Amino acid sequence: HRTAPKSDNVYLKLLVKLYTFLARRTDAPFNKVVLKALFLSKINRPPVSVSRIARALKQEGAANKTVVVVGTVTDDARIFEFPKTTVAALRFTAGARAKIVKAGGECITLDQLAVRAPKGQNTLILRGPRN
Amino acid sequence: EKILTPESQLKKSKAQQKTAEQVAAERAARKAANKEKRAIILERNAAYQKEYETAERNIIQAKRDAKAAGSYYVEAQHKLVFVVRIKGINKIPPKPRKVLQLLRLTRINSGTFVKVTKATLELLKLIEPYVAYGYPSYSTIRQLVYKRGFGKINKQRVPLSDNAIIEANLGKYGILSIDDLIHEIITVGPHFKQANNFLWPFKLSNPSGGWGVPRKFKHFIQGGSFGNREEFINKLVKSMN
């Protein structure tokens, strides 16, 4: 089992350090899933398009359930009515960031999401397709 | 002015005090529970000793009555046999090696308790040249459990030195003391398999007085060391222990 991040980015190392403590001291499996995903390689972390988030936000009660992505969020011109919601991801593209902000939503980092939801209440983790 | 304490320090102190106010009460609760558990263990041990004494006295009385009555008394077949590995890993044939592995006999001078059953009899017959077995007594089982009894805490090997260790793992089945484990080992209860698997395979040293016979690799009935040594298995285990 992958136990350390191969990425040399110090910020990702700090995120891993925080998430390990959160998972070990909280016991909530939500932190464990994010910590495990943080070790996934770039090929194993496909981007999640804003269209994917918008279509996944049709889930019941998803308006108040902040969506979480462990990879990168990319813009999508195929849609024009992105729901007003908060999205948390490591990196947000300029187009995706503008679309999310313009729609009245907000974009936050993983640490901000963890502080807001230490136990992961109402969280929704999305994973990009591999096929 | 008086330097005020840091707000973070104040919160930390308040949290520590709140946690200690519960830890202190939990300590007293644990002490009371330990006292009650010790009393229960004492009464259970007394009951087990009484049961063993009554059983042996009844067996002896039945034998004497049968002798006096001019009849034959068929003693109950032993339902528990201990097995010890006598041969090394080298050159062991494949099927006997697999049988020994299934019996947790991974090294020489190691043994475990095996329930006597119709199926296990054939398994024992299949590994006679490599293992010596017999019917252990209460004293031998108690000595083994006390001296080389190790508990398996879900992945590992832990020495059995406290009833709390047994209770934390075997307490699910009502076993809360070393005496309870010994009773469940000598008597094949419903939870015999769980107790047997919980105990780590015994690591026994070579006999203090030697194996006696000049050659070990022979049947015990012909001056050897393996095979059925029902009565002498206790002596062999005690010498090895």
Binding site: - | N45, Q49, Y146, S161
Partner: protein, 33 residues
């Protein structure tokens, strides 16, 4: 940190089995039938 061996060092033996005191009260082993 160190495994105390029962059957000796009576102090540890009593911890494992509180009935050992009652056993030693009459020695529980020379009972006459």
């Amino acid at each position: 940190v160190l495994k105390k061996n029962p059957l000796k060092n009576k102090q540890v033996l009593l911890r494992l089995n509180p009935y050992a005191k009652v056993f030693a009260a009459e020695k529980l082993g020379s009972k006459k039938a």
